[PDB]
Every structure is written in structure tokens, then in C-alpha cells.
Ligand binder design. Sequence first.
Ligand SMILES: CCc1nc(N)nc(N)c1OCCCOc1ccccc1CCC(=O)O
Length: 161
Amino acid sequence: HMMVGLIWAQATSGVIGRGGDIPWRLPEDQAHFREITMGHTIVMGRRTWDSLPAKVRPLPGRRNVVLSRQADFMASGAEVVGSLEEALTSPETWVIGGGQVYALALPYATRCEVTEVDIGLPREAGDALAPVLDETWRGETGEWRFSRSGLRYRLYSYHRS
Ligand SMILES: CCc1nc(N)nc(N)c1OCCCOc1ccccc1CCC(=O)O
């Protein structure tokens, strides 16, 4: 049984953070992200891996896998694979970005963990949007919470079988 999960953070506009490209300051999201993914395999694209801050490259305490079709691409502290199917060896796999990988992994996913940030961030050219969730996703919607940054945010935990 190879369970796939997706986890991301988005503005209310749907615009998602990708790797180190995160425009909002929301410290609690990192603790939330770590609580979900710790002790599991995490899968990310090349562009996401590249945009990671060097201090968190690779991400500590987790089996890092990078999805790249470029055959010459290497990355210290992570396993590179050329197919998403090859990355889903573990019993629980979390896909952590970016947009292209989300879309590839979405048909396989049975869980989505979403952080929505209450911040004005219009869609602009080059921005990735959150994967669209259809009526198959069963979801518990969290209450707006105030971050110590001053921003409001809430947690969505979606699932399907
Ligand atoms: C916390 C950011 C984040 N939050 C959620 N809910 N989903 C993501 N896919 C996500 O991005 C994960 C990849 C980027 O991760 C970082 C980007 C900049 C600084 C620190 C981290 C995470 C470091 C860590 O997890 O130890």
C-alpha cells in the first residue's frame, strides 16, 4: 500500500508557495509542515529543490526524493528519480512542490494538507496555483487563527479513498 499525500501553503487567491519562494511570513506553517512530514518520504521537483535555502537542503529528518527528467542532474543528500512511480516506494509519501509535481501526483493522492494564508496576493504571470480539488475530497475546514506574524491562517485536512 503506497499512500500519497500532498501538502502546500497558499494565499486566498490560490497562489502557492514553492520551495523557498514564499512571500508570507507564517512561522507556524513550518511547524505544521514538519509535523506532517517528519518520519516520512518527501518528493519534490528540481526547481523546488533548487529554490530551497542551502541550510534546509536537504530537509532534515526525512528521506528526500527529487523528481527530474534531466538525466545529468544530481543533488547531495537526496535520491534522484526520473518517474513519480519510482518515488512512491515508501508506505507514506508527501509531495511538497511544486506545481508541476502536484499535478503529476494528484491522481495518486488520498490526502491533502493545506495551509491557507489570509493575504492579498493576485495571480501574476509565472505564479503557480493550488491543485483544484473536486467533490471526491472529504474535508474538515479549520477556524481562522492569528499567527504570531499578525496574519490570519487556517488549516485544511482533505482526504479520499
Ligand atoms: C514550510 C513551507 C511549506 N509549508 C507547507 N504547508 N507546505 C509546503 N510544501 C511547504 O514547503 C516545503 C518546502 C519549502 O520548505 C522550506 C522553505 C524555506 C524555509 C524552510 C522550509 C522548510 C524547512 C523544514 O521543513 O525543515
